[PDB]
Design a protein around this ligand. Structure first.
Ligand code: MG
Ligand code: MG
Ligand code: MG
Ligand code: MG
Ligand code: MG
Ligand code: MG
Lengths: 159, 88, 183, 78
RNA sequence: AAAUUGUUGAAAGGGAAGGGCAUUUGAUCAGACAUGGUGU
RNA sequence: GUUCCUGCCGAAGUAGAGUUAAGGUGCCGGAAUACACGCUCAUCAGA
RNA sequence: CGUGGAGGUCAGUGACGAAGCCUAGACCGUAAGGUCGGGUCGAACGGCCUCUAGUGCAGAUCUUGGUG
């Protein structure tokens, strides 16, 4: 219940409260790595809500991006990559969008190592990633190119 | 040694930044302080000069007037009181 | 009269000792307090307990520091400077264990508090409020008292030597001629 | 709190630290009213004077030997 | 047009930005007697 | 409701020096933690 | 002291920068304020004698928009 309240305050109206909640959640993960999966699940529980609101999901994606991953946490990384892709399809389906895509690409790049997902999953979004590379915000195109390079290398596409 | 003075402490202001209260060692009574009236005071590098004006209370504390008032951060700072102008 | 004054805490009242020390610090004198655990307060144990509580640092030294800071205008530059001049300790840490320690008569409990009036020891208060170090300090104090007994024996021998030397100086002429002539 | 007891001495009133009473000046003709009172008064060029006129006023003031309170203003800054 | 919101860029900082106080070390600026006369 | 600033008259001032009333002299805070008496420490002590 | 109105006046001020506004700058006045410097401003306006209008705040019912 305490975690529910704390992660609920990610979607607060005031950006200061959301930032404080994100910082405290990241501190909580560091203090107790074992609850990292529970914290990530709780954050996912809000970001995917039908009434999530752009502020809440944006700060939640930031918090998920700033999580730390180890080479034995494939389940957590496999959770995070799928969550990022689901959110990406949710919002793709502009300036506010560009920042959220930047953060989502950052998260997918962070979690693409440590993630044992079939390459075919990324192949579905590959064209979409290229659509980002010519986007208005170059900060998104950098991360899109990073993701494209990583997927191409691991999947051994023609490149 | 070449000391021809007594190093005394600056206590506080009169309460008036113009007047300062000086505590001089080995002076328990106003009668003892009466000797030191008119002597030159020197707070020490830069030096500010002044003089002892009159006694203050029964503890032997004396009043003092400097050409420029002390900066108020010297309460408890060491201050010199020379023997000249001598009256003996 | 000394660059540094070491004041024993035993048998003193917190208010009077703190006031005297604060007055000295404001005059530039450097003072260090030791053996503050055995400091005394007037009243009964409960009343001081609830006073420190309605304040609620658990150590006796910190309680003394608060009491003294109440005198000094700490928020001013001068008050801060007076505060760095101060030092407080429970028991005697080095190197002050090798230095004799004065007593302030104005704050002495024996001279101030009337016989048959309840008082309170700061150590018991600090332990009751959550200071879990009164035990280690006591053993150090016992060792210090053994060392002090040895030092007292050495001082008695030194006083005997001083008496012998004073006798030796007596049978010299120049001092006797000087005293008769003047001084 | 302001009150009459704070009033300054008449002999020292309306005096700059240079010791010269400030007098506003617009043109050369008004400058020439201060020809001899150089000790008592110092000229001050008005704010609305153009740069071309200020140099003429300064030259005439130097010729007369009258102290200008604000020279090098709008010919230099500060 | 204000007020308001968002992307991008610079800087500081820390979980808040934040101030006041003290010390420390530095950098940089202003600082006449144009002293009236005589003498070799 | 209040009524730009200063001054003035009137029912029922600024600065230096000294003195002083009311007060006060444990510290913040300038002054004796001076003296001399009678008391009182009460689970309502007493400022 | 400050704000406008009118008459008179300063052979007033002005692209070599008028009016307006700001100015934790300098000078003056006990103060209301005034003068200058700088910034801003970019085309006209101010000082002075007279008569005539005319000095900054508080709070409530709430209202509206906007945001939760
Ligand atoms: Mg101007
Ligand atoms: Mg940076
Ligand atoms: Mg008077
Ligand atoms: Mg007119
Ligand atoms: Mg103005
Ligand atoms: Mg003035």
């Amino acid at each position: 219940n305490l975690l529910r309240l704390g992660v609920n305050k990610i979607g607060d109206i005031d950006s200061k409260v959301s930032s404080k909640a994100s910082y405290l959640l990241l501190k909580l993960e560091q203090a107790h790595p074992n609850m990292k999966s529970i914290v990530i699940d709780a954050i996912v529980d809000i970001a995917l809500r039908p009434n999530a609101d752009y502020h809440t999901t944006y700060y939640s994606v930031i918090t998920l991006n700033q999580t730390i991953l180890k080479r034995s946490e494939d389940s957590v990384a496999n959770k995070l990559v799928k969550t990022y892709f689901t959110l990406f399809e949710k919002f793709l389906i502009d300036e506010k969008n560009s920042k959220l895509f930047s953060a989502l690409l950052t998260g997918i790049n962070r979690a693409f190592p440590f993630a044992q997902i079939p390459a075919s999953v990324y192949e579905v979004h590959m064209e979409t990633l290229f659509k980002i590379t010519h986007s208005s915000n170059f900060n998104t195109s950098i991360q899109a190119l990073v993701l494209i390079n990583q997927v191409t290398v691991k999947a051994k596409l023609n490149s | 040694s070449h000391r021809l003075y007594v190093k005394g402490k600056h206590l506080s202001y009169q309460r008036n930044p113009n007047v300062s209260l000086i505590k001089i060692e080995g002076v328990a009574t106003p009668q003892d302080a009466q000797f030191y009236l008119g002597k030159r005071i020197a707070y020490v590098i830069r030096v500010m000069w002044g003089k002892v004006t009159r006694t203050h209370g029964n503890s032997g504390v004396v009043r003092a007037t400097f050409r420029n008032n002390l900066p108020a951060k010297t309460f408890g700072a060491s201050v010199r009181i020379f023997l000249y102008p001598s009256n003996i | 009269v000394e660059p540094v004054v070491v004041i024993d805490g035993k048998g003193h009242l917190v208010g009077r000792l703190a006031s005297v020390v604060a007055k000295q610090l404001l005059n530039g004198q450097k003072i260090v307090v030791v053996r503050a655990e055995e400091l005394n307060i007037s009243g009964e144990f409960f009343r001081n307990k609830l006073k420190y509580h309605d304040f609620l640092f658990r150590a006796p030294s910190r309680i003394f520091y608060k009491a003294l800071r109440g005198m000094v205008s700490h928020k001013t530059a001068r008050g801060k400077a007076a505060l760095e001049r101060l030092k407080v300790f429970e028991g005697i840490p080095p190197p002050y264990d090798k230095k004799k320690r004065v007593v302030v008569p104005q704050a002495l409990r024996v001279l101030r508090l009337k016989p048959g009036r309840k008082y309170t020891t700061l150590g018991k208060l600090s332990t009751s409020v959550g200071w879990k170090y009164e035990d280690v300090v006591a053993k150090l104090e016992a060792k210090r008292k053994v060392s002090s007994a040895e030092y007292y024996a050495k001082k008695r021998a030194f006083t005997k030597k001083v008496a012998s030397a004073n006798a030796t100086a007596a049978e010299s002429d120049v001092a006797k001629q000087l005293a008769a002539l003047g001084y | 709190q302001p009150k009459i007891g704070y009033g300054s001495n008449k002999k020292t009133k309306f005096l700059s630290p240079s010791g010269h009473k400030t007098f506003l000046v617009a043109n050369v003709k008004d400058l020439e009213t201060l020809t001899m009172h150089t000790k008592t008064y110092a000229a001050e060029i008005a704010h609305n004077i153009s740069a071309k006129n200020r140099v003429v006023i300064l030259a005439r003031a130097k010729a007369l030997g009258i102290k200008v309170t604000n020279p090098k203003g709008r010919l230099a800054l500060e």
